[PDB]
Amino acid sequence: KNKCVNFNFNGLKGTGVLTESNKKFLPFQQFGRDIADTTDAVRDPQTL
Amino acid sequence: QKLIANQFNSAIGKIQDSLSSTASALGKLQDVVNHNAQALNTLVKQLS
Amino acid sequence: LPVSMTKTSVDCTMYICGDSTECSNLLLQYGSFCTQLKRALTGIAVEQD
Ligand SMILES: *[C@@H]1O[C@H](CO)[C@@H](O)[C@H](O)[C@H]1NC(C)=O
């Protein structure tokens, strides 16, 4: 966390900084998108 | 001279009042910013 | 009367490939598409100034 690392999240590969989210996903939601279909947030499959 | 000065002052007051009241007076200048922002947004959207 | 635009600079490699290193390597194969676009944008910025 708080470091640029190559992450493979549930089959999603990318590079960036992982930080605690301040946006409240609803229980059924498990993946967020920004403008232009850019992954902005995601929940941990092992800890949710 | 006095009449001309009074007319000039009244005209400047009318100009400021019209500028304050008319929010669309500066549309010609907002137009360039609107085009730039919309072009940037469209370029971003093309990634999706 | 308008007098200038917003000085915009585009990092084309990030836009096209993002964080993908292989895509960036493949993008080198296209030639000087980067250079012309960057030069045009810089010219436009100096133009506005
Ligand atoms: C994942 O599995 C491990 C090993 O069985 C277990 O200790 C852990 O509690 C599990 N986590 C969740 C969120 O189920």
Q: What is the DSSP letter of A17?
A: E
Q: What CA–CA distance (Å, rounded) separates A31 from A18?
A: 14
Closest CA to A15 of A24, A26, A4, A23: A4
B6-36: b (≥16 Cβ within 10 Å) or e: eeeeeeeeeeeeeeeeeeeeeeeeeeeeeee
Q: Tokens for A11?
A: 């089959």
Closest CA to C8 of C46, B31, B48: C46
Residue of chain C nearest B36, judged by CA positions: C6
Q: What CA–CA distance (Å, rounded) separates C8 from B38?
A: 13
- Phi, psi at A18, each rounded to 5°: -100, 120
HSE-up of B6 (CA within 13 Å, CB side)? 3
Q: Where are the beta strands (DSSP E) in chain C?
A: none
Q: Tokens for A3?
A: 């470091």
CA separation (Å) from A33 to A37, A39, A40, A42?
6, 5, 5, 9
**Burial group, residue A35, by CB count within 10 angstroms (0-12, 13-18, 19+):** exposed
> Which experimental method was this entry solved with?
cryo-EM
Q: What is the DSSP letter of C18?
A: T
Residue B16 distance to chain C (closest CA, Å): 18
The answer to whether C22 faces chain A, any CB pair under 8 Å, is no
Judged by DSSP in three states, A16 sits in strand
Q: What is the DSSP letter of C43?
A: H
Interface residue of A8, A15, A35, A37 to substitute, partner C, most C CBs within 10 Å: A15
Cross-chain Cβ contact B44/A37 below 8 Å: no
Residue C14 near residue C25, CB atoms below 8 Å: no
The residues that bridge with A9 in the sheet, in sequence order, are A12
Residues of C in contact with B32 (CB under 8 A): 2, 5
Residues of B in contact with C8 (CB under 8 A): 36, 40
What's the gap in Å between A11 CA and the centre of ligand 1? 19
